[PDB]
Amino acid sequence: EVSVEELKAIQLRTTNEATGEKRFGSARAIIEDLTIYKSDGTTLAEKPLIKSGEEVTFDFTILASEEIKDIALGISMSKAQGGDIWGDSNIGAGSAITLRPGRQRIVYKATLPINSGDYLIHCGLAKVGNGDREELDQRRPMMKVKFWSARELGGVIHAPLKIISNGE
């Protein structure tokens, strides 16, 4: 179908250097690409800004050389200078996934209450069980993303106060 040999070559070849992506894994299957859509339906290439609190779609193209049961396809985000502020996967969602040979598309959505700033997106593909975890394709960092908001808040959590009573 597609040789792991090819997937290994794909993996080594397609590595984003604008973020200094370090990429590892057995490459039995790989994250061929990730495309991110905003609520208005536009991409990051089309508009690289995400509004704080916007619903985002993560469109994964997964390319597998063979079938692989019980995988974990995860994604996370860190501040341009720091550790992860957000991370999740199908495992956290309680949703099992099995990869089939050839291309396949897995789609996640999330509403991201993240304050304005520059962040990094990471994603990872691994096999959960049968012995210990097996990393298939870990992409770190995969891409940059900037959040913007109508008004500025403290920290990273976008949770604006509602004023119920101002003693007025």
Interface with a copy of itself (CB under 8 A): 57-58, 62, 75-78, 83-90, 92-93, 95-100, 104-114, 151-157, 159-168
- Least CB distance to Cl ion at residue 33 (A): 9
**In angstroms, what is the minimal distance from the CB of 160 to a copy of itself?**
6
Residue in 35, 39, 61, 90 binding Cl ion, rule: CB under 5 A: 35
Phi, psi for 19 (deg, rounded to 5): -115, -5
Q: Of the two residues 3 and 16, which places its CB atom closer to Cl ion in the complex?
A: 16
Among 31, 36, 114, 136, contact with Cl ion (rule: CB under 5 A): 36
Pull the structure tokens for residue 102.
């050839």
Query: What is the distance between the alpha carbons of residues 126 and 137, in angstroms, rounded to a whole number?
Result: 7
Q: Which residue in 16, 42, 43, 95 binds Cl ion (CB under 5 A)?
A: 43
Which residue, 74, 72, 71, 35, is CA-closest to 56?
35
**Rounded (5°) CA angle 7-138-89:** 115
Residues that bind Cl ion (CB under 5 A): 35-36, 43-45
